[PDB]
Ligand binder design. Structure first.
Ligand code: ADP
Ligand code: ADP
Ligand code: CL
Ligand code: CL
Ligand code: CL
Ligand code: CL
Ligand code: MG
Ligand code: MG
Ligand code: MG
Ligand code: MG
Lengths: 493, 493
């Protein structure tokens, strides 16, 4: 915590928040459930108002049940029912309908109960929160969230990697001490190579999605020479490095490790697909490891957000060897292209080569296309029966026959025998211990450089729009995680 | 703390306080200095805003100096100067003018400094408080202050005394447990004896004055049969009882005890006279002792509040033997009549009889008048030289020659040799140990009864106006003293 910048984190007088009161989305789900500081303040409100004690405690107890160890869940289920649902219980929740109480006592246990609790809280209690000091305090935090926090607030201290338009640095937010990755995009190069649209798509997607399986955007700003995206630091290298460059004589992963990453990637794909986004660039090098060994998908510049009521799109984009037949054939396509790419990615994790080309085999584009469109993939012994079936189901040429996103989720896919030893609740909650933990002393990265133009208003306005500033949810997470929320939200110190 | 009533003490939603925001006096002195909860919230505001730390701490340190023991004041004076006034002091108070800093370092030390600190705080910092959550919290407390807290909130448990229109009871405020005296005025009797004007004057004065030397009014309400004034409980009896009825064979007080009460009564008189009120009924029976042995003046039904720009009044009122010559002569008079009554009161405390009549001597009104107007008071040996001079100065027939209120205070009077061993700072602050402490087991009171009419709108409207409800300053003191303020002013429990 550099004190100069820490000192600029101060809550404003209430008059300064009046514009925000009119401009913000202040809906229940968006404010009190999704935004961490909103949720904290709403729960503080409920905690100070006796009437709402039962409801608050039931809510917390369901959320605790949902992330409990399997060994303790039967206990927690019995304690919850005894506390809130049995006839004369001391915290009996009078607001619940009889069906919901009945459903809750029999036998995503409590997911219906949670929906009912949250539905209750979004009515009278939310209205009372809006008429409380805690709502005004939320507005003060939103004002602070919106203040300039640009290049001066970040200390770049190490190069993490090299992209097409600049380096990615390990950096520290000076006020809080939180470590991030800062991806720099050189303005002149972006302009020269007509990279504006791609840069903006990546920024917009990373800003709007919130998943433990996708790198999160916390800040977007500009300097004289660069656009900058401050995002989750992934210190563990990329899957490509780990397939080939750690144990070079024996490349590839053991099945359990490959399956674990597959399960995480699938969860990230699902999250995009539920938001009508097609990734279009899944491959080992775009999947990054954190220092715990959990992975996230990254590099979202080729992604497409389908319009409202848009079921399919068109356009040639992606990496040769990962692009699905329907894309290569120039047809309309949807999320299915990403599942094709997942099959290729799993294949490579196990085989240490791609399904269509041997090591060192370099072919004309036309030949690679004909192989992806027509050639039957072959599977060595390394592949267990479950691995082969799964790959086969994902590498199907016809997208209508391909395994993937069905009925608004990947639940169908999750039931595949490949995932027999994966506990999905704990995977999705980030509870499971990864099979590989990167060494903090080790850098999991590879050790040539490339060879002027005035900017006009059109360029500078684009850079200004790109530099949208601070993303609400990650910023609020940072403030809470680093202790600044606790420190500034004091009432009587 | 009866829980039924304690449960009704809950802070409202902010929408309920909007009327109060428009109707209340929200000036700096009235809100942030005089009202205990206002002061507490303003100081909490200052404590949470780094800029105002020096100012807040200097303020607190001056107030602590003002109530410190004489033995520790030199220390405290040196510490204050070193902390806030010396050139490069860590909490140097930049806002102070050079004169004031200079004055503060040389040689009511710090009274000029306090005025300057408070003048500073009443500008920018007060404006910032008004734009804070702490001001809104003040409004919530003011809303609660204004809610119905009538007959049902009080438990009468013992008779303390008998007045002209009803009994005075020891009572408990059910929600907080605080002990009070409740003076009841029977409605039918008040009406019959045309006692409305007197009842109202007492209520209005006790509500508006705030002195440790005058009984404080906390609540005024009505029942079907009575008007009720809830005020400071004075469990120690009255001075009349203590002069005559404790040691019956040897009545009267030792000089030091008499002098101490005189000093307290003088302080109470001064407080009324600074507020342009003439008491008109000082006598031993109207001076009550608390369980510490400190006294207060009480029984304010004969008082008169001089109008704005009114220097003198007219009207025959008071107790025979305590009424001054100018009153008896039917002339205009001011505060001087109360100093005459003080001389009579001191005389009786020492002599165990009045100055104009021997024990058992009962005379025509005309004879008593002639004695008060013309007779020279004589003083037994019991009176020390200082006691006699003081009485003489107070019993002067001509009010122009009489000792009393001069230049807006009683400071002239305080310098009299009578008060040689009285430390006035500590007296006025309630620090001094009284010379007599009443026994809690003992009742300091004497052990015949007196022998119907429909009420009209005119009566019921008067009773309604009388029943003005809760007095701000005592109610806020109660909430703080009993812990309810602490309990309800929690932010994150
Ligand atoms: N969040 C991150 N944490 C750590 N390293 C990163 C992160 N994002 C990118 N990198 C490193 O920087 C490289 C370039 O980033 P990338 O997003 O792939 O850029 P481009 O869009 O130009 O390909 C990556 O291959 C990786 O080595
Ligand atoms: N605050 C009090 N605490 C304890 N006893 C009180 C208090 N006020 C009055 N009393 C008792 O009740 C008696 C009657 O009250 P008082 O105010 O003198 O009534 P009145 O105006 O009718 O003379 C007093 O003489 C005293 O004994
Ligand atoms: Cl509130
Ligand atoms: Cl390939
Ligand atoms: Cl505030
Ligand atoms: Cl007399
Ligand atoms: Mg890349
Ligand atoms: Mg890219
Ligand atoms: Mg009386
Ligand atoms: Mg009276």
């Amino acid at each position: 915590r550099d004190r100069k910048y820490l000192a600029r984190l101060k809550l404003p007088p209430l008059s300064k928040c009046e514009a925000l009161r009119e401009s913000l989305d202040l809906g229940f789900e968006g404010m009190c459930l999704e935004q961490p500081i909103g949720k904290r303040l709403f729960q503080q409100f409920l905690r100070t108002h006796e009437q709402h004690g039962p409801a608050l405690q039931l809510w917390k107890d369901i959320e605790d049940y949902d992330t409990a160890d399997d060994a303790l869940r039967p206990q927690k289920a019995q304690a919850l029912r005894a506390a809130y649902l049995e006839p004369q219980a001391q915290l009996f929740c009078s607001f619940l309908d009889a069906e919901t109480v009945a459903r809750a006592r029999a036998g995503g246990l409590f997911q219906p109960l949670l929906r009912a609790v949250l539905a209750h809280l979004g009515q009278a209690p939310f209205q009372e929160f809006l008429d409380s000091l805690y709502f005004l305090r939320f507005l003060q935090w939103k004002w602070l969230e919106a203040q300039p926090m640009g290049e001066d607030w970040f200390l770049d201290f190490r190069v993490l990697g090299r992209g097409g338009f600049g380096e990615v640095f390990a950096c520290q937010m000076k006020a809080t001490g939180k470590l991030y990755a800062c991806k720099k995009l050189n303005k002149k190069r972006l302009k020269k190579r007509k990279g504006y649209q791609g840069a903006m798509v990546e920024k917009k997607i990373l800003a709007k999605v919130h998943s433990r399986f996708i790198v999160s955007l916390a800040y977007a700003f500009e300097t004289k020479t660069d656009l900058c995206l401050v995002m989750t630091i992934m210190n563990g290298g990329d899957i490509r490095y780990h397939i080939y460059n750690v144990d070079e004589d024996n490349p590839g992963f053991q099945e359990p490790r490959a399956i674990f990453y597959t399960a995480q990637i699938v969860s990230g794909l699902e999250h995009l697909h539920q938001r009508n986004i097609i990734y279009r660039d899944l491959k080992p090098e775009n999947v990054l490891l954190d220092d715990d060994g959990n992975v996230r998908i990254s590099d979202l510049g080729l992604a497409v957000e389908l319009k409202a009521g848009q079921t399919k799109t068109k356009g040639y984009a992606g990496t040769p060897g990962f692009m699905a037949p329907e894309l290569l054939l120039g047809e309309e396509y949807d999320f299915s292209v990403d599942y094709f790419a997942l099959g290729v990615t799993l294949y490579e994790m196990i085989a240490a080569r791609g399904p269509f080309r041997a090591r060192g085999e370099k072919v004309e584009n036309k030949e690679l296309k004909q192989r992806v469109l027509e050639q039957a993939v072959t599977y060595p012994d390394k592949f267990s029966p479950a691995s082969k079936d799964f790959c086969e189901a994902l590498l199907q040429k016809d997208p209508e026959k391909r395994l993937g996103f069905r009925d608004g989720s990947c639940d169908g896919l999750r039931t595949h025998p490949l995932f027999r030893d994966i506990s999905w609740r704990q995977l999705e909650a980030g509870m499971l211990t990864p099979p590989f933990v990167p060494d903090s002393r080790t850098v999991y990265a590879k050790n040539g450089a490339f060879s002027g133009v005035a900017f006009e208003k059109a360029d500078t306005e684009f850079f200004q729009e790109f530099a949208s500033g601070t993303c609400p949810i990650p910023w609020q997470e940072e403030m809470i995680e680093t202790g600044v929320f606790g420190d500034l939200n004091v009432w009587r110190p």
